[PDB]
Amino acid sequence: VFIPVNRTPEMQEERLKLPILAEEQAIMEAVAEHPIVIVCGETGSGKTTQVPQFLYEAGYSSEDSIIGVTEPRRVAAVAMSQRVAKEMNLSHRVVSYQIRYEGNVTEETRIKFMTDGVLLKEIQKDFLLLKYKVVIIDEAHERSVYTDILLGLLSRIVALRAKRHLPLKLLIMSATLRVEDFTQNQRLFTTPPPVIKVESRFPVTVHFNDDYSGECFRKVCKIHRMLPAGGILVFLTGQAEVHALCRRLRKAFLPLHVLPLYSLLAPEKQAQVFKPPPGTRLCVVATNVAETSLTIPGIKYVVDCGKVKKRYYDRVTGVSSFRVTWVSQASADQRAGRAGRTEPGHCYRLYSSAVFGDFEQFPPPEITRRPVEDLILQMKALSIEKVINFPFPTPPSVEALVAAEELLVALGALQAQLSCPITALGRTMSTFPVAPRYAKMLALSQQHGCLPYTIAIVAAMTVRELFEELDREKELAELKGRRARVAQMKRTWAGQGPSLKLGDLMVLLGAVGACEYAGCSPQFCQANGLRYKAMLEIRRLRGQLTTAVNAVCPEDPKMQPPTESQVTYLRQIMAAGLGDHLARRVQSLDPKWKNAYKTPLLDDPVFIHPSSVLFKELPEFVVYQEIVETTKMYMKGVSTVEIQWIPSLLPSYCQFDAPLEEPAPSYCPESGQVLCHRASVFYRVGWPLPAVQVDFPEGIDRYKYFAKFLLEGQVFRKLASFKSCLLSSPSTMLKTWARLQPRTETLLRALVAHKADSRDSLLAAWKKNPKYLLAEYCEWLPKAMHSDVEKNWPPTTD
RNA sequence: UUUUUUUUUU
């Protein structure tokens, strides 16, 4: 049971400062008595660090059974692993972190810190989480997509483990007080788990009072002249406000060190905030990064916009947009908490006391605001067929769940309309750590040696804000030259000719290749307008994407430039990934459509993005990565599609009239199926598409054509020897002068009975009984031949 | 056709 730690005297006093220590036996008694415990403790409560220690003291860690702790951030995983390992007297062999592309875990590991996504991937490998006896899910109040999928899954895992008489304990740790979606949720936890509230210790003063930027300049002005020396933090909506206020404040200046903070800021400039100020007071203009991501020790006065920037996905169109709205009360309070963490602090809210009540208490969960295809593909891999049966803490919209299954079926991830389970292709995609669209690109890309190219493109698309912003006399020319420098570079990476057809996606590839060519130089990144932090993240992601692919397909990471054929094959892999994102140029009217494109998903005209390399080229068909609305509805991530590609690449999105007699249907040896040329038209828009070789539609005519090719020996080459001796032509399966011939019906009926319209279908039928078509096939040969046929009847080897 | 990303987990 009990396990020692050997506390050092100096860390003892610190540890005793935190409040949760008093309630240790209370939390440990709850954990023993209940299967699931919810621990609610504000920042500084020390719950995250100490609760794994308590359970370690109670002996939950063991050989097969360890304590796990899941976190939203990578940083919080590693940092927490280190702090606990030092707060206890234990090696990082015992207390470890696992994050995306780094590791710390050993058989010695008894407390494991991890990101929520890492736990999900373990749930894929073993759904029972046998290697865990306790799982702690921390920062549940953040309600990230992975916390939600984890909480719903673990309720089932806890149940499955319990009936196996191997109890798994789940502890849910929340900084905020409200857990209604957990306690009141009948589907998630049939019995409301006990809720433990831990108080913690530096009070925050809140002051209530068109453009939030102006008042903030005033507030920062008024505070600074008036109040004692202490850190100033201002929350602003976006980067340009941050820069507008910093330059404005620098112009304004007794002491003041002005530092702008935003997530994409260069890590060097970022770091300036934490270090204390050089007769100069600290005032930092920041986005939400200061609210959670960064903790600034010297801050004593915060000024609050009252406004957040968020990204909204339109379900009908699929389109994304960036809008500014009122903060949540919890976001408003948490921003205030930043003010007074190591001294009494001041929060001045630029909204009225009345406005604060108008705020939505809790921000909407991140799952409801975005496509959920990645999760459902994960859920389908765990055999969760009925998505609505899943116990979402907050369920996503119906249209969101229906859209996802439509996309995942369209990629081939989910089979077949009564149900759609994961496919073999869908199962291997589930392993890849990227969105299922790019996941299919990866699975599709295992050919022509462009796999590292596609891995690089996908990695460059998955990363956010690849290119440095560089926006908003002699100083303007320095900045303006940089833009022309980066634009010229973007064009240089994307060649002219077939290379330019890959467009923006080629520009990402050429950016990744050029960066790796210079050994990912920070000098190179600043020279060519690439972002250094993003480029490193690109490199790490390519590594993890390359290792994952090797698991699926047994077979030099930093690459060499592609040949023209490779670039066009890259175009086809990308178009197949982005099938739902196809636009056609308009030619015929309204002045709004002069250079526009039309996409079936939305009525409005869409345009190539002005910074895109395909902007002036304006090809007739493109696939876009995403559509973002600002002033117009713009296509970003654009690549060219050759119109004839569409039916062979995106057959699910097309509608074919009838199979064509000219050219006549053929048999495909690789597929094992009947092919035919079919004319097609895109589903909602009505775009005419040429006739191309496509699989023959399922139907009674398909069986006839397959039966013809089988008798000719094309389907199975063992039967090909007999083709000379057949009594009537194989052609009589389609049409015959001998109407009363029974030969053709008997073969066709037997084929229908076993749904044998393909090599794989018939080969399957021969497993269930290997003499399946023997009688019927013999009907087509003279009797003397029958015995030799039966002797080698399976016309398949193996 | 003319560029206006908040924040983060595999």
Side-chain angles (χ1 to χ4, degrees):
Chain A
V1 186
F2 185 93
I3 302 180
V5 155
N6 300 252
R7 297 160 304 285
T8 298
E10 297 301 328
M11 41 207 62
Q12 263 179 327
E13 59 185 349
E14 306 144 26
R15 174 158 172 183
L16 278 169
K17 296 169 187 169
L18 47 76
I20 183 169
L21 253 190
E23 300 175 73
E24 164 178 0
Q25 272 164 298
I27 293 176
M28 290 328 295
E29 210 83 36
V31 178
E33 280 161 27
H34 311 87
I36 295 153
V37 188
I38 300 196
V39 187
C40 300
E42 305 184 26
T43 74
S45 200
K47 48 168 213 311
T48 303
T49 38
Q50 309 297 339
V51 181
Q53 303 196 49
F54 298 172
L55 283 112
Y56 192 75
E57 300 267 304
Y60 288 89
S61 166
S62 295
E63 74 311 4
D64 199 8
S65 287
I66 71 165
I67 298 166
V69 183
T70 64
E71 296 281 337
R73 332 268 183 265
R74 295 168 183 139
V75 159
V78 185
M80 232 54 54
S81 184
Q82 294 183 344
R83 182 82 187 112
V84 154
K86 309 260 176 164
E87 280 197 0
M88 309 179 107
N89 236 36
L90 285 174
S91 39
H92 296 163
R93 303 168 175 155
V94 170
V95 165
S96 75
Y97 75 87
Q98 194 160 328
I99 51 172
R100 174 158 217 169
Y101 345 79
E102 283 180 2
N104 198 359
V105 303
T106 308
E107 54 174 350
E108 279 164 80
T109 287
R110 293 317 194 243
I111 287 183
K112 180 154 158 204
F113 276 74
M114 58 198 343
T115 39
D116 37 57
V118 173
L119 182 48
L120 166 58
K121 283 306 153 142
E122 275 173 304
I123 295 192
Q124 278 304 144
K125 311 250 217 198
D126 175 61
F127 61 95
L128 276 196
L129 261 42
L130 295 177
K131 205 91 184 90
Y132 295 87
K133 212 77 183 186
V134 179
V135 171
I136 301 188
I137 298 183
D138 205 357
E139 311 309 85
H141 62 299
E142 286 186 14
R143 298 289 309 277
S144 83
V145 162
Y146 292 138
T147 59
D148 297 19
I149 302 314
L150 277 187
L151 287 160
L153 284 167
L154 275 181
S155 74
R156 179 73 172 153
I157 294 171
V158 159
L160 266 46
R161 284 278 297 274
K163 285 192 186 176
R164 291 215 173 178
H165 288 303
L166 281 173
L168 163 81
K169 299 273 168 196
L170 169 61
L171 263 87
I172 312 174
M173 247 119 71
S174 155
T176 51
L177 293 178
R178 304 288 198 254
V179 297
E180 290 134 53
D181 300 12
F182 309 125
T183 168
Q184 111 178 323
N185 189 315
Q186 190 182 344
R187 279 201 321 284
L188 192 36
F189 300 127
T190 42
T191 302
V195 167
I196 304 174
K197 174 177 178 174
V198 179
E199 279 173 66
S200 67
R201 289 184 187 173
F202 279 165
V204 188
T205 307
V206 179
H207 293 287
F208 287 81
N209 296 311
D210 225 10
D211 73 310
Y212 35 61
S213 270
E215 300 280 54
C216 193
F217 174 69
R218 299 209 113 191
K219 294 301 180 196
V220 160
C221 273
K222 231 168 292 215
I223 293 162
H224 190 64
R225 292 172 179 196
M226 292 299 289
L227 289 182
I232 307 191
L233 195 40
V234 30
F235 294 96
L236 287 185
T237 286
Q239 125 154 254
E241 281 164 17
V242 166
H243 279 298
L245 197 45
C246 267
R247 277 175 160 173
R248 182 170 179 172
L249 285 174
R250 290 181 73 155
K251 278 174 58 179
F253 291 97
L254 172 73
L256 196 49
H257 191 33
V258 181
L259 291 180
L261 209 42
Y262 54 89
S263 188
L264 291 352
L265 185 69
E268 296 187 47
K269 299 187 189 174
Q270 236 169 126
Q272 294 176 344
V273 182
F274 278 178
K275 298 182 147 181
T280 311
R281 195 142 99 118
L282 185 55
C283 125
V284 192
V285 197
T287 55
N288 297 281
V289 167
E291 188 178 329
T292 59
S293 191
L294 299 191
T295 66
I296 309 177
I299 299 302
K300 194 153 163 26
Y301 318 83
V302 299
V303 187
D304 197 15
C305 278
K307 295 275 190 146
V308 178
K309 191 168 279 177
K310 274 168 168 183
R311 169 164 169 167
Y312 304 97
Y313 275 87
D314 185 338
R315 270 186 306 266
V316 191
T317 63
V319 170
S320 317
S321 41
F322 295 88
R323 298 164 168 148
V324 181
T325 59
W326 286 121
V327 310
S328 67
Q329 309 210 332
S331 303
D333 295 349
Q334 192 204 329
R335 286 187 192 181
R338 294 290 118 156
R341 210 196 176 177
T342 312
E343 276 172 41
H346 279 284
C347 178
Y348 318 103
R349 301 180 160 176
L350 276 55
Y351 36 107
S352 86
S353 48
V355 171
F356 187 61
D358 306 320
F359 288 176
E360 292 278 316
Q361 190 185 10
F362 283 105
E366 147 182 307
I367 188 156
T368 68
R369 311 165 29 81
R370 64 142 100 152
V372 300
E373 4 122 34
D374 183 57
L375 318 172
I376 304 194
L377 194 41
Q378 302 288 164
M379 278 166 50
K380 295 295 189 170
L382 297 175
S383 293
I384 305 193
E385 309 286 331
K386 238 212 186 184
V387 296
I388 66 157
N389 278 344
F390 194 97
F392 313 89
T394 302
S397 46
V398 188
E399 344 178 9
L401 295 163
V402 156
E405 297 204 357
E406 269 176 356
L407 183 48
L408 291 181
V409 162
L411 301 161
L414 311 180
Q415 185 194 338
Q417 275 188 344
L418 181 66
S419 64
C420 54
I422 198 172
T423 61
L425 161 74
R427 175 95 51 194
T428 77
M429 274 193 230
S430 72
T431 73
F432 297 152
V434 190
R437 270 188 219 118
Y438 309 155
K440 184 177 181 212
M441 298 178 185
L442 295 186
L444 230 37
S445 179
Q446 324 179 359
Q447 60 186 319
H448 280 87
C450 35
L451 174 61
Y453 297 136
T454 306
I455 291 167
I457 308 175
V458 169
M461 279 176 304
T462 295
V463 67
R464 108 127 169 170
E465 226 91 305
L466 173 42
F467 288 90
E468 203 200 343
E469 175 56 61
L470 320 162
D471 204 5
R472 298 206 176 163
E473 287 177 5
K474 282 265 212 65
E475 191 186 352
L476 297 180
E478 161 178 17
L479 305 174
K480 184 184 179 179
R482 182 67 81 78
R483 286 192 288 267
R485 182 179 296 191
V486 179
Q488 218 190 16
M489 213 48 57
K490 285 190 189 177
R491 276 180 277 111
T492 310
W493 292 329
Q496 306 184 256
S499 147
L500 196 40
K501 303 277 219 7
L502 191 59
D504 289 314
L505 309 179
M506 172 59 133
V507 186
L508 301 185
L509 179 48
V512 172
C515 191
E516 272 351 279
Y517 172 93
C520 209
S521 154
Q523 304 199 305
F524 176 99
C525 288
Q526 192 253 156
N528 284 7
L530 311 171
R531 264 174 16 98
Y532 194 41
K533 226 201 172 60
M535 290 319 219
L536 273 168
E537 250 279 355
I538 291 180
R539 161 153 70 176
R540 299 189 218 104
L541 171 51
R542 302 185 53 208
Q544 185 185 17
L545 278 185
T546 41
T547 69
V549 159
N550 188 22
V552 187
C553 198
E555 48 81 32
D556 146 68
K558 305 333 192 329
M559 281 181 305
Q560 325 264 318
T563 297
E564 295 165 342
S565 264
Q566 279 170 333
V567 187
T568 303
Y569 283 117
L570 279 177
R571 293 215 290 117
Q572 308 189 30
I573 280 148
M574 297 307 286
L578 307 162
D580 44 344
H581 294 178
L582 178 67
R584 182 187 69 161
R585 213 198 153 179
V586 151
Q587 74 170 355
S588 63
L589 276 66
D590 226 344
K592 59 165 184 231
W593 310 84
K594 188 56 173 185
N595 282 320
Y597 286 70
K598 218 175 286 191
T599 78
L601 286 197
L602 50 82
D603 297 325
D604 276 334
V606 194
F607 303 83
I608 287 185
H609 200 274
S611 77
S612 166
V613 188
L614 297 187
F615 179 73
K616 275 159 183 188
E617 299 289 312
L618 282 161
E620 203 203 336
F621 284 93
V622 304
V623 279
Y624 56 88
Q625 181 201 336
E626 81 194 351
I627 287 184
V628 187
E629 191 199 330
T630 67
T631 61
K632 296 165 93 151
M633 275 200 174
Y634 280 119
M635 277 168 351
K636 306 176 71 192
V638 200
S639 163
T640 62
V641 185
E642 292 304 328
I643 173 183
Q644 68 265 16
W645 297 0
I646 309 170
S648 55
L649 279 186
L650 321 176
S652 44
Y653 297 97
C654 306
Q655 323 177 331
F656 311 76
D657 305 333
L660 254 50
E661 321 199 319
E662 39 102 18
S666 43
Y667 163 77
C668 176
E670 300 50 83
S671 157
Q673 293 179 124
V674 193
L675 315 173
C676 66
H677 286 58
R678 315 185 64 184
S680 71
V681 160
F682 222 52
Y683 56 102
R684 191 171 149 86
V685 278
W687 299 334
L689 299 182
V692 186
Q693 196 162 224
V694 178
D695 300 1
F696 200 111
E698 333 182 339
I700 289 169
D701 270 333
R702 201 213 144 122
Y703 287 92
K704 298 181 188 179
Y705 269 100
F706 176 76
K708 163 192 196 166
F709 300 145
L710 186 52
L711 298 165
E712 297 173 347
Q714 305 177 53
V715 182
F716 290 104
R717 251 197 275 128
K718 271 203 202 165
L719 303 167
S721 86
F722 297 88
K723 65 174 187 201
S724 57
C725 300
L726 270 82
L727 301 182
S728 70
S729 179
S731 320
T732 73
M733 294 297 312
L734 315 172
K735 282 186 185 208
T736 178
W737 286 111
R739 287 192 152 268
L740 288 196
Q741 194 52 226
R743 208 184 348 256
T744 48
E745 182 183 354
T746 64
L747 178 50
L748 170 67
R749 293 295 169 259
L751 285 175
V752 175
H754 301 47
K755 306 161 217 170
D757 52 321
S758 76
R759 159 199 61 159
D760 316 76
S761 299
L762 171 55
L763 181 55
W766 273 330
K767 281 189 203 301
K768 288 217 151 120
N769 192 352
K771 301 213 167 184
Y772 151 48
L773 275 181
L774 173 80
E776 283 75 353
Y777 178 79
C778 275
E779 206 164 341
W780 287 77
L781 286 172
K783 261 174 178 187
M785 314 219 54
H786 287 197
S787 186
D788 196 78
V789 173
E790 194 283 321
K791 166 176 163 152
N792 63 333
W793 164 234
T796 176
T797 169
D798 319 330

Short mmCIF file of all heavy atoms in Angstrom, two decimals, chain A residues 116 263 287-288 293 464 472 609 630 632, chain B:
data_model
loop_
_atom_site.label_atom_id
_atom_site.label_comp_id
_atom_site.label_asym_id
_atom_site.label_seq_id
_atom_site.Cartn_x
_atom_site.Cartn_y
_atom_site.Cartn_z
N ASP A 116 -3.45 14.94 -24.08
CA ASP A 116 -4.70 14.22 -24.23
C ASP A 116 -4.72 13.40 -25.51
O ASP A 116 -5.28 12.31 -25.55
CB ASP A 116 -5.87 15.20 -24.19
CG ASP A 116 -5.56 16.51 -24.88
OD1 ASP A 116 -5.21 16.48 -26.07
OD2 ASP A 116 -5.68 17.57 -24.22
N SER A 263 1.10 34.74 -30.10
CA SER A 263 1.64 33.39 -30.17
C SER A 263 2.69 33.24 -31.26
O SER A 263 3.74 32.62 -31.04
CB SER A 263 0.52 32.38 -30.40
OG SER A 263 0.99 31.05 -30.28
N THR A 287 -2.56 38.90 -26.86
CA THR A 287 -3.78 38.19 -27.20
C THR A 287 -4.08 37.18 -26.08
O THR A 287 -3.52 37.30 -24.99
CB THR A 287 -3.63 37.53 -28.58
OG1 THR A 287 -2.45 36.71 -28.59
CG2 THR A 287 -3.49 38.60 -29.66
N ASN A 288 -4.93 36.18 -26.34
CA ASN A 288 -5.26 35.19 -25.31
C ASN A 288 -4.04 34.41 -24.82
O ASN A 288 -4.15 33.73 -23.79
CB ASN A 288 -6.30 34.19 -25.81
CG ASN A 288 -7.62 34.83 -26.14
OD1 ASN A 288 -8.43 35.13 -25.25
ND2 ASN A 288 -7.87 35.03 -27.43
N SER A 293 -1.65 30.45 -22.05
CA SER A 293 -0.44 29.87 -22.60
C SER A 293 0.80 30.37 -21.88
O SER A 293 1.73 29.60 -21.62
CB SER A 293 -0.35 30.18 -24.08
OG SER A 293 0.68 29.43 -24.70
N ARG A 464 0.33 25.74 -38.68
CA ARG A 464 -0.41 26.98 -38.77
C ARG A 464 0.55 28.15 -38.93
O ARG A 464 1.65 28.15 -38.36
CB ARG A 464 -1.31 27.17 -37.53
CG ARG A 464 -0.84 28.24 -36.56
CD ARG A 464 -1.95 29.22 -36.28
NE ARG A 464 -1.64 30.11 -35.17
CZ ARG A 464 -2.37 31.17 -34.87
NH1 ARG A 464 -3.42 31.48 -35.62
NH2 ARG A 464 -2.04 31.93 -33.84
N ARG A 472 1.28 45.81 -42.11
CA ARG A 472 0.77 46.95 -41.35
C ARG A 472 1.87 47.71 -40.59
O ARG A 472 1.87 48.94 -40.52
CB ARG A 472 -0.30 46.50 -40.37
CG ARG A 472 -1.50 45.90 -41.04
CD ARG A 472 -2.72 46.07 -40.15
NE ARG A 472 -3.94 45.58 -40.78
CZ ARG A 472 -5.06 45.31 -40.10
NH1 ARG A 472 -5.08 45.47 -38.80
NH2 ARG A 472 -6.15 44.85 -40.70
N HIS A 609 -7.13 33.37 -53.93
CA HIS A 609 -6.61 34.34 -52.99
C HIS A 609 -5.54 35.21 -53.66
O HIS A 609 -4.73 34.71 -54.43
CB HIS A 609 -6.03 33.64 -51.76
CG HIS A 609 -5.90 34.52 -50.56
ND1 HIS A 609 -4.80 35.32 -50.34
CD2 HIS A 609 -6.74 34.74 -49.52
CE1 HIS A 609 -4.96 35.99 -49.22
NE2 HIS A 609 -6.13 35.65 -48.70
N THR A 630 -12.99 37.00 -45.71
CA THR A 630 -12.63 38.28 -45.11
C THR A 630 -13.46 39.38 -45.77
O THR A 630 -14.61 39.61 -45.40
CB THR A 630 -11.13 38.57 -45.22
OG1 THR A 630 -10.76 38.77 -46.60
CG2 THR A 630 -10.30 37.43 -44.63
N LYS A 632 -13.84 39.28 -49.35
CA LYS A 632 -14.50 38.35 -50.24
C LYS A 632 -14.36 36.94 -49.67
O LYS A 632 -13.73 36.73 -48.63
CB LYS A 632 -13.92 38.44 -51.66
CG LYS A 632 -14.17 39.80 -52.29
CD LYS A 632 -13.31 40.06 -53.52
CE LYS A 632 -14.03 39.65 -54.80
NZ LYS A 632 -13.59 40.46 -55.97
"O5'" U B 1 -11.30 41.91 -61.46
"C5'" U B 1 -12.31 41.51 -60.54
"C4'" U B 1 -11.79 40.48 -59.57
"O4'" U B 1 -11.03 39.48 -60.28
"C3'" U B 1 -10.85 40.98 -58.48
"O3'" U B 1 -11.57 41.49 -57.38
"C2'" U B 1 -10.02 39.74 -58.12
"O2'" U B 1 -10.65 39.00 -57.09
"C1'" U B 1 -10.07 38.91 -59.42
N1 U B 1 -8.77 38.81 -60.12
C2 U B 1 -8.17 37.56 -60.08
O2 U B 1 -8.69 36.61 -59.50
N3 U B 1 -6.97 37.45 -60.73
C4 U B 1 -6.32 38.46 -61.41
O4 U B 1 -5.23 38.20 -61.94
C5 U B 1 -6.99 39.72 -61.40
C6 U B 1 -8.17 39.86 -60.78
P U B 2 -11.11 42.83 -56.61
OP1 U B 2 -12.11 43.05 -55.53
OP2 U B 2 -10.85 43.92 -57.58
"O5'" U B 2 -9.75 42.44 -55.88
"C5'" U B 2 -9.74 42.14 -54.48
"C4'" U B 2 -8.34 42.03 -53.91
"O4'" U B 2 -7.41 41.57 -54.93
"C3'" U B 2 -7.75 43.33 -53.34
"O3'" U B 2 -7.01 43.02 -52.16
"C2'" U B 2 -6.78 43.77 -54.44
"O2'" U B 2 -5.72 44.58 -54.00
"C1'" U B 2 -6.29 42.43 -54.97
N1 U B 2 -5.78 42.48 -56.35
C2 U B 2 -4.42 42.34 -56.54
O2 U B 2 -3.64 42.20 -55.62
N3 U B 2 -4.00 42.39 -57.85
C4 U B 2 -4.79 42.56 -58.96
O4 U B 2 -4.28 42.58 -60.08
C5 U B 2 -6.19 42.68 -58.69
C6 U B 2 -6.63 42.64 -57.42
P U B 3 -7.61 43.39 -50.71
OP1 U B 3 -9.09 43.29 -50.79
OP2 U B 3 -6.97 44.64 -50.24
"O5'" U B 3 -7.08 42.22 -49.77
"C5'" U B 3 -7.49 40.87 -49.96
"C4'" U B 3 -6.53 39.91 -49.31
"O4'" U B 3 -5.43 39.64 -50.21
"C3'" U B 3 -5.90 40.42 -48.01
"O3'" U B 3 -5.75 39.34 -47.09
"C2'" U B 3 -4.54 40.95 -48.46
"O2'" U B 3 -3.55 40.95 -47.46
"C1'" U B 3 -4.20 40.01 -49.62
N1 U B 3 -3.37 40.61 -50.68
C2 U B 3 -2.06 40.20 -50.84
O2 U B 3 -1.53 39.36 -50.13
N3 U B 3 -1.37 40.79 -51.87
C4 U B 3 -1.84 41.75 -52.75
O4 U B 3 -1.10 42.19 -53.63
C5 U B 3 -3.20 42.12 -52.53
C6 U B 3 -3.90 41.56 -51.54
P U B 4 -7.04 38.52 -46.58
OP1 U B 4 -6.85 37.07 -46.86
OP2 U B 4 -8.28 39.21 -47.01
"O5'" U B 4 -7.01 38.69 -45.00
"C5'" U B 4 -5.79 38.72 -44.27
"C4'" U B 4 -6.02 39.38 -42.94
"O4'" U B 4 -5.42 40.70 -42.94
"C3'" U B 4 -7.48 39.57 -42.57
"O3'" U B 4 -7.65 39.40 -41.17
"C2'" U B 4 -7.75 41.02 -42.97
"O2'" U B 4 -8.81 41.64 -42.27
"C1'" U B 4 -6.40 41.68 -42.67
N1 U B 4 -6.10 42.85 -43.51
C2 U B 4 -6.81 44.02 -43.28
O2 U B 4 -7.66 44.11 -42.41
N3 U B 4 -6.47 45.08 -44.08
C4 U B 4 -5.52 45.08 -45.09
O4 U B 4 -5.35 46.12 -45.73
C5 U B 4 -4.84 43.83 -45.26
C6 U B 4 -5.13 42.78 -44.49
P U B 5 -7.93 37.93 -40.59
OP1 U B 5 -8.99 37.27 -41.42
OP2 U B 5 -8.16 38.07 -39.13
"O5'" U B 5 -6.58 37.15 -40.93
"C5'" U B 5 -5.45 37.19 -40.06
"C4'" U B 5 -5.78 36.52 -38.77
"O4'" U B 5 -6.18 35.15 -39.03
"C3'" U B 5 -4.69 36.47 -37.71
"O3'" U B 5 -5.30 36.72 -36.44
"C2'" U B 5 -4.21 35.02 -37.77
"O2'" U B 5 -3.71 34.54 -36.54
"C1'" U B 5 -5.48 34.28 -38.17
N1 U B 5 -5.25 33.03 -38.91
C2 U B 5 -5.07 31.89 -38.17
O2 U B 5 -5.09 31.87 -36.95
N3 U B 5 -4.87 30.74 -38.89
C4 U B 5 -4.83 30.63 -40.27
O4 U B 5 -4.63 29.52 -40.77
C5 U B 5 -5.02 31.86 -40.98
C6 U B 5 -5.23 32.99 -40.29
P U B 6 -4.68 37.78 -35.41
OP1 U B 6 -5.15 39.15 -35.73
OP2 U B 6 -3.23 37.48 -35.28
"O5'" U B 6 -5.30 37.31 -34.03
"C5'" U B 6 -4.99 36.02 -33.55
"C4'" U B 6 -5.77 35.67 -32.32
"O4'" U B 6 -7.09 35.20 -32.70
"C3'" U B 6 -5.20 34.52 -31.51
"O3'" U B 6 -4.15 34.92 -30.66
"C2'" U B 6 -6.42 33.99 -30.78
"O2'" U B 6 -6.75 34.84 -29.69
"C1'" U B 6 -7.50 34.15 -31.85
N1 U B 6 -7.67 32.93 -32.66
C2 U B 6 -8.31 31.85 -32.07
O2 U B 6 -8.72 31.87 -30.93
N3 U B 6 -8.45 30.75 -32.88
C4 U B 6 -8.04 30.61 -34.18
O4 U B 6 -8.24 29.54 -34.76
C5 U B 6 -7.39 31.76 -34.73
C6 U B 6 -7.23 32.84 -33.96
P U B 7 -2.76 34.10 -30.64
OP1 U B 7 -1.85 34.85 -29.75
OP2 U B 7 -2.35 33.83 -32.05
"O5'" U B 7 -3.15 32.71 -29.96
"C5'" U B 7 -3.75 32.69 -28.68
"C4'" U B 7 -4.36 31.35 -28.36
"O4'" U B 7 -5.51 31.11 -29.21
"C3'" U B 7 -3.48 30.13 -28.59
"O3'" U B 7 -2.53 29.91 -27.57
"C2'" U B 7 -4.51 29.01 -28.72
"O2'" U B 7 -5.00 28.63 -27.44
"C1'" U B 7 -5.64 29.72 -29.46
N1 U B 7 -5.56 29.49 -30.92
C2 U B 7 -6.08 28.30 -31.38
O2 U B 7 -6.60 27.48 -30.64
N3 U B 7 -5.98 28.09 -32.73
C4 U B 7 -5.42 28.94 -33.65
O4 U B 7 -5.41 28.62 -34.84
C5 U B 7 -4.90 30.15 -33.10
C6 U B 7 -4.98 30.38 -31.79
P U B 8 -1.14 29.17 -27.91
OP1 U B 8 -0.39 28.92 -26.67
OP2 U B 8 -0.48 29.85 -29.04
"O5'" U B 8 -1.57 27.70 -28.33
"C5'" U B 8 -1.24 26.61 -27.49
"C4'" U B 8 -2.33 25.56 -27.50
"O4'" U B 8 -3.44 26.02 -28.31
"C3'" U B 8 -1.93 24.22 -28.10
"O3'" U B 8 -1.30 23.37 -27.17
"C2'" U B 8 -3.26 23.68 -28.62
"O2'" U B 8 -4.01 23.10 -27.56
"C1'" U B 8 -3.95 24.96 -29.08
N1 U B 8 -3.69 25.26 -30.50
C2 U B 8 -4.32 24.53 -31.48
O2 U B 8 -5.11 23.63 -31.24
N3 U B 8 -4.00 24.90 -32.77
C4 U B 8 -3.13 25.90 -33.15
O4 U B 8 -2.93 26.11 -34.34
C5 U B 8 -2.51 26.61 -32.08
C6 U B 8 -2.81 26.27 -30.82
P U B 9 0.15 22.76 -27.46
OP1 U B 9 1.09 23.29 -26.44
OP2 U B 9 0.44 22.96 -28.90
"O5'" U B 9 -0.02 21.20 -27.19
"C5'" U B 9 -0.46 20.32 -28.22
"C4'" U B 9 -1.50 19.35 -27.72
"O4'" U B 9 -2.81 19.97 -27.77
"C3'" U B 9 -1.66 18.07 -28.52
"O3'" U B 9 -0.71 17.09 -28.14
"C2'" U B 9 -3.10 17.65 -28.22
"O2'" U B 9 -3.18 16.91 -27.01
"C1'" U B 9 -3.80 19.00 -28.03
N1 U B 9 -4.58 19.42 -29.21
C2 U B 9 -5.92 19.70 -28.99
O2 U B 9 -6.44 19.60 -27.89
N3 U B 9 -6.62 20.09 -30.10
C4 U B 9 -6.14 20.24 -31.38
O4 U B 9 -6.91 20.61 -32.27
C5 U B 9 -4.75 19.94 -31.53
C6 U B 9 -4.03 19.55 -30.47
P U B 10 0.42 16.62 -29.17
OP1 U B 10 1.50 16.04 -28.34
OP2 U B 10 0.68 17.72 -30.13
"O5'" U B 10 -0.27 15.41 -29.96
"C5'" U B 10 -0.86 14.34 -29.24
"C4'" U B 10 -1.12 13.13 -30.11
"O4'" U B 10 -2.28 13.38 -30.95
"C3'" U B 10 0.02 12.76 -31.05
"O3'" U B 10 0.05 11.34 -31.22
"C2'" U B 10 -0.41 13.40 -32.37
"O2'" U B 10 0.15 12.78 -33.50
"C1'" U B 10 -1.93 13.25 -32.31
N1 U B 10 -2.67 14.27 -33.07
C2 U B 10 -3.54 13.86 -34.05
O2 U B 10 -3.72 12.69 -34.34
N3 U B 10 -4.21 14.87 -34.71
C4 U B 10 -4.09 16.22 -34.48
O4 U B 10 -4.76 17.01 -35.16
C5 U B 10 -3.17 16.57 -33.44
C6 U B 10 -2.51 15.61 -32.79
#
